[PDB]
Every structure is written in structure tokens, then in C-alpha cells.
Amino acid sequence: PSSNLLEQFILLAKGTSGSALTALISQVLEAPGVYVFGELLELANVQELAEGANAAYLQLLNLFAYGTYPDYIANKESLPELSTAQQNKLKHLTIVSLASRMKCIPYSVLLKDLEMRNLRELEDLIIEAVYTDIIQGKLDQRNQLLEVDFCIGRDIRKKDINNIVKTLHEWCDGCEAVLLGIEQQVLRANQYKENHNRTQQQVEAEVTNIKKTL
Amino acid sequence: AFSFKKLLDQCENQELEAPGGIATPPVYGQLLALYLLHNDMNNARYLWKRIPPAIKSANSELGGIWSVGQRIWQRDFPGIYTTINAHQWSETVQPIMEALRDATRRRAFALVSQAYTSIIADDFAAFVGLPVEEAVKGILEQGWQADSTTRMVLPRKPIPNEQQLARLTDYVAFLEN
Amino acid sequence: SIDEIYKYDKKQQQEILAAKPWTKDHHYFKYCKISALALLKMVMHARSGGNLEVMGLMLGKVDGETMIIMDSFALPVEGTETRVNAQAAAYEYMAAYIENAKQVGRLENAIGWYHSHPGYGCWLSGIDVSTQMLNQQFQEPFVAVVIDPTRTISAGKVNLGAFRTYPKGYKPPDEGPSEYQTIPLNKIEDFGVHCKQYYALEVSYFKSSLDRKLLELLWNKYWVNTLSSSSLLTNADYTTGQVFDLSEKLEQSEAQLGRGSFMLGLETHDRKSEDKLAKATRDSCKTTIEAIHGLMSQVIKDKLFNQIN
Numbered sequence: 001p002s003s004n005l006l007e008q009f010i011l012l013a014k015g016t017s018g019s020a021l022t023a024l025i026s027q028v029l030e031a032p033g034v035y036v037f038g039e040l041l042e043l044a045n046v047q048e049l050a051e052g053a054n055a056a057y058l059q060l061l062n063l064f065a066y067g068t069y070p071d072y073i074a075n076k077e078s079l080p081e082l083s084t085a086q087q088n089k090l091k092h093l094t095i096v097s098l099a100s101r102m103k104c105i106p107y108s109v110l111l112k113d114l115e116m117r118n119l120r121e122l123e124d125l126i127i128e129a130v131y132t133d134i135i136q137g138k139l140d141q142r143n144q145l146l147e148v149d150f151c152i153g154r155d156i157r158k159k160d161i162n163n164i165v166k167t168l169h170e171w172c173d174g175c176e177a178v179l180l181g182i183e184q185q186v187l188r189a190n191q192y193k194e195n196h197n198r199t200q201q202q203v204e205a206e207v208t209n210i211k212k213t214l
Numbered sequence: 215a216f217s218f219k220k221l222l223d224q225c226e227n228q229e230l231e232a233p234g235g236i237a238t239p240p241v242y243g244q245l246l247a248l249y250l251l252h253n254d255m256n257n258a259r260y261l262w263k264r265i266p267p268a269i270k271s272a273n274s275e276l277g278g279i280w281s282v283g284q285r286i287w288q289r290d291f292p293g294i295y296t297t298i299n300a301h302q303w304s305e306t307v308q309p310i311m312e313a314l315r316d317a318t319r320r321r322a323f324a325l326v327s328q329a330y331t332s333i334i335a336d337d338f339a340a341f342v343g344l345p346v347e348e349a350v351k352g353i354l355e356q357g358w359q360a361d362s363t364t365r366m367v368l369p370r371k372p373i374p375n376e377q378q379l380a381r382l383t384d385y386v387a388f389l390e391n
Numbered sequence: 392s393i394d395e396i397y398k399y400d401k402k403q404q405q406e407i408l409a410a411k412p413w414t415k416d417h418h419y420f421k422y423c424k425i426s427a428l429a430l431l432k433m434v435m436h437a438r439s440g441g442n443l444e445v446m447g448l449m450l451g452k453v454d455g456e457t458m459i460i461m462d463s464f465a466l467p468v469e470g471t472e473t474r475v476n477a478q479a480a481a482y483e484y485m486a487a488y489i490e491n492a493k494q495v496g497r498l499e500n501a502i503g504w505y506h507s508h509p510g511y512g513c514w515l516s517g518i519d520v521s522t523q524m525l526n527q528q529f530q531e532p533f534v535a536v537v538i539d540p541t542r543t544i545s546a547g548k549v550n551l552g553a554f555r556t557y558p559k560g561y562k563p564p565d566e567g568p569s570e571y572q573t574i575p576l577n578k579i580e581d582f583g584v585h586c587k588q589y590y591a592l593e594v595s596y597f598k599s600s601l602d603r604k605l606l607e608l609l610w611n612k613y614w615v616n617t618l619s620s621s622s623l624l625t626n627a628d629y630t631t632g633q634v635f636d637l638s639e640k641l642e643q644s645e646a647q648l649g650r651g652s653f654m655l656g657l658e659t660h661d662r663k664s665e666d667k668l669a670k671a672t673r674d675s676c677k678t679t680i681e682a683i684h685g686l687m688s689q690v691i692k693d694k695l696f697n698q699i700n
């Protein structure tokens with residue numbers, strides 16, 4: 001029901017705004033379920049908050065959209081104080097960013113990037129994220145590793161569109177190169193078959209010539 | 215190394231194409247030194263036996279290189295380095311002699327690292343032809359372990375897609391006919 | 392011409408049925424060519440069955456030493472595997488089915504019977520042998536086909552055999568390679584017995600437009616993940632069995648050659664030894680091409696996916 005709640009707040013943001021909107025955004029950061037904040041950021045009233053006097057909540061929402069937990073630790077003075085639900089949601093988002101790059105995460109990295117002291121609560125946060133269908137993976141405790149098979153994606157600041165285009169172009173070029181290599185293999189196999197047929201017909205011609213000789 | 219191999223091949227060709235059947239003393243000196251560089255002891259020994267004694271008597275430097283080669287055959291590194299740095303080598307022999315000196319260092323460095331889990335500092339110093347103390351900092355900067363109490367050194371032992379596709383196509387072509 | 396085999400020549404079939412060359416040789420029929428359609432239908436019916444034996448009739452024709460199966464159809468009978476000539480209960484049905492098939496342009500007549508052995512290999516039991524003997528007493532040119540749908544699925548390779556019986560009293564000649572099958576304890580005892588009893592027909596088949604439609608459609612989507620790993624040969628049961636049979640064949644060839652060195656002037660032994668060595672070599676070769684193609688597909692796809700960019 002997070003998407004339905006997200007859409008209702010989107011409809012409400014089209015009208016009422018201001019301190020109510022900032023409190024509403026704080027409720028979004030506290031209400032579990034919402035893992036995508038890109039749709040909220042594109043509302044015109046969020047842009048109204050940009051030129052508005054209040055900016056702590058906007059910088060808070062901006063960090064949830066693009067920043068991670070370590071950036072939030074750096075901005076503990078310019079951001080409104082979070083709740084236990086807001087902190088866990090941001091920690092889950094940070095884990096998503098970490099799992100996006102590397103599919104295997106050692107426990108040392110988990111204890112470092114997330115201000116995690118007790119490993120017990122680290123396991124509790126990891127299982128909580130998985131059971132809310134955020135990340136799919138497996139935990140290796142003997143090697144102290146977190147193997148993540150699948151994870152949800154994240155938002156884009158419209159500056160990564162160029163990177164997406166470059167990646168798609170690279171994929172297309174690689175596919176075309178593999179196709180050309182396959183076609184070259186077609187040609188080489190056909191040439192080898194033609195050479196075998198030429199050898200066979202040469203043998204047959206030699207046999208027929210000897211038969212005519214005798 | 216690559217230039218030394220090219221120089222060796224050129225010197226080898228000149229010996230085969232010798233007009234009077236004998237090569238110039240610089241060619242023989244270069245050939246003998248280059249064989250020692252590559253640790254080709256058999257070729258160095260056979261070439262020394264091939265050289266007439268007249269050149270050996272008229273060129274005492276040739277005997278000095280052979281004496282070093284005998285030391286290399288016996289693999290007495292403290293003796294090898296002493297003999298290398300004892301005789302003055304001409305401008306055609308000094309650079310290649312230093313390359314042999316460097317080659318001996320790398321060889322003995324690898325021999326100790328592979329074979330010797332532990333080695334006395336004096337023994338390692340003798341093997342590398344350097345005194346003990348700066349040899350220790352040379353290997354500590356190499357990420358090795360040294361025990362000061364027992365003076366023991368603990369060395370730390372250290373296809374493209376197109377080629378694969380060509381090989382697999384060769385597999386199929388060979389097995390198809 | 393790919394479609395030449397689909398042409399039906401009635402007079403030519405009548406001429407072959409009047410000639411009866413199979414009466415001159417009990418090993419006359421050596422090859423069995425099966426259309427895509429027939430095989431597919433049979434497999435589907437057997438798998439719908441699941442663990443119970445089903446059976447049906449095969450429509451087709453003969454061409455030299457080759458028996459050709461063009462189509463098949465299920466028979467509504469009980470007692471497949473327990474009743475001798477169970478097919479007989481469907482006589483009336485068979486007559487009507489064929490009559491109605493002729494009305495829509497199915498010209499080929501009965502060429503054999505097929506039945507399934509779910510999870511116990513492909514062979515002829517005492518009952519199957521009695522049935523096919525009767526089927527070769529009135530309708531001499533009859534081929535018995537046996538399919539294991541369960542092993543097809545588990546092995547990832549079609550498990551089908553085509554068989555013909557020997558007449559009562561007649562003994563088979565020296566040759567009989569007999570590929571070993573993993574039939575259950577007592578079922579395998581009876582299997583050795585009946586592999587000594589009958590003779591298999593070299594599966595030949597024919598690539599056609601029916602095959603072209605199937606291969607194209609299924610590979611496009613059922614193999615969107617053309618991956619399906621890449622090595623269903625990983626199971627060390629088929630390739631390993633072929634390797635062991637190869638080893639046994641070459642060991643027997645060496646045993647024959649060693650004894651043949653004392654006899655001076657035995658050409659037939661040399662001929663047989665050379666032929667056996669050649670057959671073993673070709674079998675090993677084809678296994679090698681299969682493995683190489685598997686690795687090639689694996690390498691191309693996994694390289695592309697893992698490290699495209």
C-alpha cells in the first residue's frame with residue numbers, strides 16, 4: 001500500500017503545501033514501505049519548497065533521494081532530526097547503494113559505512129530489509145560476507161542519463177561485435193566445408209581418371 | 215634482454231660466417247659473456263673449448279671471463295661477484311658483465327625466496343653479494359620477515375576471446391571432416 | 392529435396408508389399424525414420440500418462456531396408472504391458488480412425504505400434520515380444536517403438552527405441568552390441584534376456600519443414616534464456632556410459648587382435664577389427680563435437696553477459 005499512500009500524498013501535495021507538506025514528507029520518511037522517492041521530488045510543490053524559506057526538510061528529502069547514510073551523518077546540523085524509522089529507511093537505502101555496486105559485501109564494510117557497532121543489530125537490520133522485499137541475497141558468516149543476489153534500484157539526478165546512454169551504446173557495440181564475430185565464424189565454417197568438398201571431389205576425380213586409365 | 219638476444223644472434227651469425235674461420239676477439243668475448251647472461255653453461259663451455267689457445271694466450275681477458283663462467287658453474291655466489299668485479303672489462307664487455315651481475319642477483323633472489331623458508335642473514339648476504347645490514351632493509355621493503363635475535367630471514371614466496379574463438383573453430387573444422 | 396520423403400507412391404508400396412523382401416532376410420529392416428509429428432505426439436501422450444503405460448498405432452511406409460513413420464495415434468486400450476496383443480481391443484477403432492484419416496488425405500497405412508515404459512528404459516518384455524511376434528505373423532512389416540517419457544525428461548535426451556522380433560526358433564548372428572540401460576533390478580534381468588532376444592533398428596529420422604517450425608518457435612521463447620545452464624551433459628550418466636562402452640569395445644578389439652596374430656591368413660578378422668575400431672572412433676568423435684559445441688555456446692554467452700561492459 002506504499003504506492004497508493006505515495007500517490008495520495010502526491011495528490012495532496014498538488015494542493016496543500018508548506019509546513020504541512022514538510023511534515024507530510026517526514027511522515028513518508030517514517031512510514032515503512034516507500035523505497036522510491038523520485039516521484040515525490042518531481043512534484044511542482046517540491047520545487048516551490050526550493051525557493052521557499054524552509055530548506056532543512058528539502059535538503060533532508062534530497063539526501064534520501066540521492067545521498068546515503070554517511071552523507072546524513074555529515075549533515076547532522078542542517079537536516080531535521082530523524083526518527084528510528086527514518087534512520088532505518090535511510091540505512092536500507094544505503095545498503096541498496098552498496099549492494100548495487102558489489103554483489104558481495106563483507107561484514108567489515110557493513111560495520112563501517114553504517115556506523116554499525118554491534119554485529120547483532122547489523123543482522124537484525126539486514127533481515128529486516130530483506131523481509132520487506134528490499135534486497136534478495138545470502139549471508140556468509142564464516143567469511144563475514146553478505147552475498148546479495150537481487151536488490152531494488154535507486155533514483156537519478158538527470159545527470160546520469162548520459163551515463164545510461166553511454167552504457168547502452170557500449171552494450172549495443174558489444175552485441176554488434178559479437179554478431180560480426182559469429183558471422184565471421186559462419187564464413188570460416190563454410191570455407192572449411194568448401195575445402196573438404198574440394199578435397200573429396202579431387203579424390204573422386206583422381207579415382208575416375210585412374211579408372212579411365214585402366 | 216631483447217637487445218642482448220639480438221646481439222647474441224648477430225654474433226652467432228658472424229661466427230658461422232667467419233671468413234678465415236676465426237672470429238674477432240670482440241665477437242668471441244661478446245658471445246661468451248652473452249652465454250653467461252642466459253645461464254647457458256653448456257654453450258659457454260663448448261665455445262670455450264672451441265676457441266684455440268692462441269686467442270686465450272693473446273687475450274687474458276678471455277680467460278678471465280671463462281674463470282667467471284667456472285664460478286657460475288660452481289654457483290659460489292660470493293666468489294662469482296668477487297670475480298665479476300675484480301677484472302676490468304672493456305667497453306664491449308663492461309655493460310654485458312653488469313647485466314650478468316644483475317641477472318645473478320635476480321636468480322639468487324628468487325632461489326632464496328623459493329627454496330628458503332628461513333635463511334641465516336649471513337648466508338642470504340653471501341648469496342646476494344651484499345653485506346648483511348642493508349640487505350635486511352632491502353628485503354623488509356620487499357615485504358619479508360626478519361628475526362634479529364636469531365639472524366634468520368623469512369622470505370615471502372610470491373587468452374583473448376578472438377584466440378579462443380579461433381581455437382574452437384579449429385576444433386569444429388578438424389572434427390567435421 | 393527435403394520434402395521428397397512426404398510424397399506417397401501407392402503403386403510402389405503395393406509392389407514392395409507384393410515382393411516381400413523381408414522374407415528373404417530376418418535382418419532385412421535396419422533403419423527406422425521417424426517424422427517430427429509422430430515422435431512429438433507419442434512423447435506428449437506418454438507424458439500425459441505420467442507413470443502408466445499407454446500405447447498407439449503408427450502410420451507410415453517402407454523404403455528398402457528403412458521403415459518410415461509419418462504419423463501416430465493413441466489407442467483407447469487397457470492392459471498395455473500386461474495383455475498380449477492388447478491393441479486388438481481397439482480393432483474397430485483403428486478401422487474407423489484410418490477410414491476417417493483417408494477422408495482427409497492421410498494415405499499412409501499401419502506400419503507399427505508404439506507404447507511407453509515410464510521410468511524403466513526402452514525394450515521388449517515377454518508380453519511385448521509375443522505381441523510384436525503376432526504383429527510380424529500377419530503383418531510381417533511391423534516395427535515396435537518404445538519410449539521412456541520419464542527418462543527423456545531426466546536425461547534431457549529423447550529416450551526411444553525401435554525393435555523387430557526374430558521368428559520362433561531362429562538364432563541371431565555374432566553381432567549384438569546392446570547398449571546397457573539402467574532398468575530396475577528384475578526389469579534389467581528381463582531386459583538383458585530380451586536384448587539377447589530381439590534386434591534394434593538404427594534410429595535415422597529426417598530433418599524437415601515440420602522440424603523447422605518446431606526448432607524455430609521453441610528456441611525463440613522457451614530459450615529466451617538460451618542459457619538453461621549450457622551443459623545438460625553435466626550428468627555423468629550418458630557421456631560416461633558412452634565412454635565405458637567405447638572402452639569395452641576397444642578392449643574386445645584388442646583381445647581379438649592379439650589372438651588373430653597367431654593365425655596367418657585370416658582376412659575377415661582384420662576386416663572386422665578395422666571396422667570396429669572405426670566405429671568406436673566415430674562414436675568418440677561425435678561425443679567430442681557435442682561437448683565442443685556445448686562449451687562454445689557456454690563461452691560465448693557467459694562472456695557476453697558477465698563482461699560486456
Ligand SMILES: [Zn+2]
Pocket residue numbers: 472506507508514515516519537
Ligand atoms: Zn513394453
